[PDB]
Design a protein around this motif. Structure first.
Motif, PDB file in Angstrom:
ATOM      1  N   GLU A 129       0.880  -1.163   0.000  1.00  0.00           N
ATOM      2  CA  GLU A 129       0.000   0.000   0.000  1.00  0.00           C
ATOM      3  C   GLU A 129       0.911   1.203   0.000  1.00  0.00           C
ATOM      4  O   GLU A 129       1.981   1.143   0.604  1.00  0.00           O
ATOM      5  CB  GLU A 129      -0.917   0.022   1.219  1.00  0.00           C
ATOM      6  CG  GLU A 129      -1.757  -1.218   1.411  1.00  0.00           C
ATOM      7  CD  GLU A 129      -2.873  -1.381   0.365  1.00  0.00           C
ATOM      8  OE1 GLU A 129      -3.427  -0.355  -0.109  1.00  0.00           O
ATOM      9  OE2 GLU A 129      -3.203  -2.550   0.025  1.00  0.00           O
ATOM     10  N   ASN A 142      -1.713   1.341  -3.397  1.00  0.00           N
ATOM     11  CA  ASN A 142      -1.707   0.401  -4.507  1.00  0.00           C
ATOM     12  C   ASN A 142      -2.676   0.745  -5.648  1.00  0.00           C
ATOM     13  O   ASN A 142      -3.126  -0.134  -6.371  1.00  0.00           O
ATOM     14  CB  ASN A 142      -2.041  -0.986  -3.966  1.00  0.00           C
ATOM     15  CG  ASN A 142      -3.510  -1.132  -3.597  1.00  0.00           C
ATOM     16  OD1 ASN A 142      -4.236  -0.146  -3.481  1.00  0.00           O
ATOM     17  ND2 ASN A 142      -3.953  -2.364  -3.414  1.00  0.00           N
ATOM     18  N   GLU A 173      -7.554   5.202  -5.886  1.00  0.00           N
ATOM     19  CA  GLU A 173      -7.849   5.283  -4.450  1.00  0.00           C
ATOM     20  C   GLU A 173      -7.011   6.414  -3.839  1.00  0.00           C
ATOM     21  O   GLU A 173      -5.780   6.301  -3.717  1.00  0.00           O
ATOM     22  CB  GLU A 173      -7.564   3.944  -3.740  1.00  0.00           C
ATOM     23  CG  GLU A 173      -8.401   2.742  -4.233  1.00  0.00           C
ATOM     24  CD  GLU A 173      -8.249   1.464  -3.375  1.00  0.00           C
ATOM     25  OE1 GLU A 173      -7.129   0.907  -3.270  1.00  0.00           O
ATOM     26  OE2 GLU A 173      -9.272   1.006  -2.810  1.00  0.00           O
ATOM     27  N   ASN A 227      -3.984   2.182   4.324  1.00  0.00           N
ATOM     28  CA  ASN A 227      -4.385   1.659   3.041  1.00  0.00           C
ATOM     29  C   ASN A 227      -5.148   2.759   2.323  1.00  0.00           C
ATOM     30  O   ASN A 227      -5.922   3.478   2.948  1.00  0.00           O
ATOM     31  CB  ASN A 227      -5.238   0.406   3.225  1.00  0.00           C
ATOM     32  CG  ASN A 227      -5.977  -0.004   1.958  1.00  0.00           C
ATOM     33  OD1 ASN A 227      -5.504   0.213   0.843  1.00  0.00           O
ATOM     34  ND2 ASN A 227      -7.146  -0.606   2.130  1.00  0.00           N
ATOM     35  N   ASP A 228      -4.924   2.926   1.027  1.00  0.00           N
ATOM     36  CA  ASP A 228      -5.725   3.880   0.296  1.00  0.00           C
ATOM     37  C   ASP A 228      -7.009   3.232  -0.184  1.00  0.00           C
ATOM     38  O   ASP A 228      -7.012   2.064  -0.528  1.00  0.00           O
ATOM     39  CB  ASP A 228      -4.939   4.482  -0.870  1.00  0.00           C
ATOM     40  CG  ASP A 228      -4.343   3.448  -1.796  1.00  0.00           C
ATOM     41  OD1 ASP A 228      -3.949   2.365  -1.332  1.00  0.00           O
ATOM     42  OD2 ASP A 228      -4.250   3.744  -3.005  1.00  0.00           O
TER      43      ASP A 228
HETATM   44 CA   LIG Z   1      -5.570   0.384  -1.548  1.00  0.00          CA
END
Ligand SMILES: [Ca+2]
Ligand SMILES: CC(=O)N[C@H]1[C@H](O[C@H]2[C@@H](O)[C@H](O)[C@@H](CO)O[C@@H]2O)O[C@H](CO)[C@@H](O[C@@H]2O[C@H](CO)[C@H](O)[C@H](O)[C@H]2O)[C@@H]1O
Length: 147
Positions: free
Chosen positions: A106, A108, A112, A128-129
Motif C-alpha cells: 500500500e 496500490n 484510491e 491503506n488507500d
Molecule cells: Ca488500496
C-alpha cells in the motif's frame, strides 16, 4: 464542558479536551462512528475546530489504535486528490515517507485517493488507500485547550 488533566508534576499545567475526546500529549482525539465520505468527514471535524487525524510518529500512531476496533476502518487526514502519488495531510504538515505506516504493498491504486487505517491479521494496524465516496468512520485531532 472540558475534561482537564494535570500534565506532569507541574500544577498550573492543566490541559483539556471536550468530554468525549481523549488525550495524548498536546492533542485531543475523537472517534466518529458515523459513516460518511472523506470529504464530509473532514468537514465534520472542521466544525469541531479540528482536522482528520494526522500521524507524525510511531507513538502517536500507537496511542491511536488503543481507541479503535479492529473490525473497523477509520479515515485518516491524508489524501492524494489527483492520483499523482503526492500525498497531503489536511493540516499542511510535510509528508515524510520515512515515517509512515502503510500496509505492505500500500498504497496500490492511483484511483484510491484517501487513506484509512485498519487491521490485518499479522500486519496488525496500518494504512491503506481507498475510495472517497465510500463512507467510513473517522478520527479527528485538535490541539488541547489550556487553563
Ligand atoms: Ca488500496
Ligand atoms: C483488507 C482491506 O483493507 N480492505 C478494505 C478495502 O481495501 C481494498 C484496497 O484499497 C486494498 O488495497 C486491497 C488490498 O488487499 O484490498 C481491497 O481491495 O477497501 C474497502 C473500501 O473500499 C474497505 O471496506 C470497508 O471496511 C470496513 C470494515 O473494515 C467497513 O465494512 C466499510 O463499510 C467498508 O467499506 C476494506 O476494509
Amino acid at each position: 464542558a472540558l475534561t482537564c488533566v494535570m500534565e506532569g508534576k507541574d500544577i498550573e499545567d492543566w490541559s483539556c479536551c471536550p468530554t468525549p475526546w481523549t488525550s495524548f500529549q498536546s492533542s485531543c482525539y475523537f472517534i466518529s462512528t458515523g459513516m460518511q465520505s472523506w470529504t464530509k468527514s473532514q468537514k465534520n471535524c472542521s466544525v469541531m475546530g479540528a482536522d482528520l487525524v494526522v500521524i507524525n510518529t510511531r507513538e502517536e500512531q500507537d496511542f491511536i489504535i488503543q481507541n479503535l476496533k479492529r473490525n473497523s476502518s477509520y479515515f485518516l487526514g491524508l489524501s492524494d486528490p489527483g492520483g499523482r502519488r503526492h500525498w497531503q495531510w489536511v493540516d499542511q504538515t510535510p509528508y515524510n515517507e520515512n515515517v509512515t505506516f502503510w500496509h505492505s504493498g500500500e498504497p496500490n491504486n492511483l484511483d484510491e485517493r484517501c487513506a484509512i487505517i485498519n487491521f490485518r491479521s499479522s500486519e496488525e494496524w496500518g494504512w491503506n488507500d481507498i475510495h472517497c465516496h465510500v463512507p467510513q468512520k473517522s478520527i479527528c485531532k485538535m490541539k488541547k485547550i489550556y487553563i
